[model samples]
Target: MIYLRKANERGHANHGWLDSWHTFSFANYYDPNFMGFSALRVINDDVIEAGQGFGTHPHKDMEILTYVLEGTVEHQDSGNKEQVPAGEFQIMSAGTGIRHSEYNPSSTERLHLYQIWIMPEENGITPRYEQRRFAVQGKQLVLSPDARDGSLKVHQDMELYRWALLKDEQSVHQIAAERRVWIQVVKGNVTINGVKASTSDGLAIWDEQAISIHADSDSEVLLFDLPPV
Candidate 1:
């Protein structure tokens, strides 16, 4: 079965300096039926105006992943302070607890990013953070539970794959029995299986043998292979 989460239906918030769209219940947005999908708790699409960003905040018992689609993010945390540029992937495991802040350092460019939170497999462990730039093309694994294939490690039994496809390009992913998948179209348009999805749209899949993605336009997407809830 496949369920579509349209971009326009997501919760939206505009704070002058920041504009955000929440795929799941976040901050001031709540939907009982859209609290989360399996262990994937949150997917927030955010755009920050120049010289603006999120203030220091605390997180615990969650695996947070950040994907910068445009501009740059100046990040500071207990473990490291660094700049995450476009095309970079960052993961922070707030096992026991962690405090961090993110800002757009560019004075002229707005920052566009996706912040995803997945429930950790365990709780009260040590906190950690990792970030890197992946050579994403076609479909590439960028995050995994064991950090396999040089992907960032997350505290969950899931894998994240990124796709950068040109128009008419197609890709396939074989699904293990009982495992589920979540597809997020970051930019452009694509047809998953036979259903069409555009930028910022999300699809939840289960009871499927495989996923076939055909890009209708130049596109970027994220795929999560997860254990069934």
Candidate 2:
């Protein structure tokens, strides 16, 4: 079976200095049908104006991760740390508890980023932070599950991967046997199993031993290939 979630259907908020779109129920946005899937919880697409950002806040037992699309985000956490513009991928494992803040480092432009939360399988450990940059090349592979130097890794059996498609070029990804996969197109058009998807479109496929994806255009995508519980 396959399901589709249009990006525009997500809950959105436009604060003076920030614009955000929530994929699932978040803050004051409530969607009974889209609460969450598997261990994946919050997914927020945020654009933070310069000199403005989220104040320090607390979180617990979440494998938090972020991917910056543009500009820079300065991050500070309960661990008494500071990270800057070079921070492309920022992550923290809030095992027991932790507080952190993120702000745009620029005084004029806004920083765009994606924040994803995967519920931790275990609880009550320690908090930590890490970051890395994965600039794509050609129709390339971006993020993966394995630890790449300082890149973030989670405890779940699922792997998050990305691919960027160039003009008229396509790539096919075979799913792990017995696993389900979710494909989200960040931009451009893609045809999966002959189904066409445009920017901000998502597709979910299940109950199969394998699945495949063909990027129909110059596009960026994320694959959530998860193990069945």
By TM-score, the best candidate is 1
TM-score of 2: 0.88
**Which regions of candidate 2 fall more than 4 Å away from where they truly are?**
84-87, 138-151
| lDDT tens readout by residue for model 1, 55-139 | 9888989999999999999998865679999989998888889999899999999999999999999999789888988754667
Model 2 weakest lDDT span, ten residues long: 135-144
How does each model score on TM-score?
Answer: 0.96, 0.88
What are the lDDT figures for the candidates, one per model?
0.92, 0.74
For model 1, give the RMSD to the true fold. 1.2
RMSD of each: 1.2, 2.4
Weakest 10 consecutive residues of candidate 1 by summed lDDT:
132-141
Error of 2 at 196 (Å): 2.0
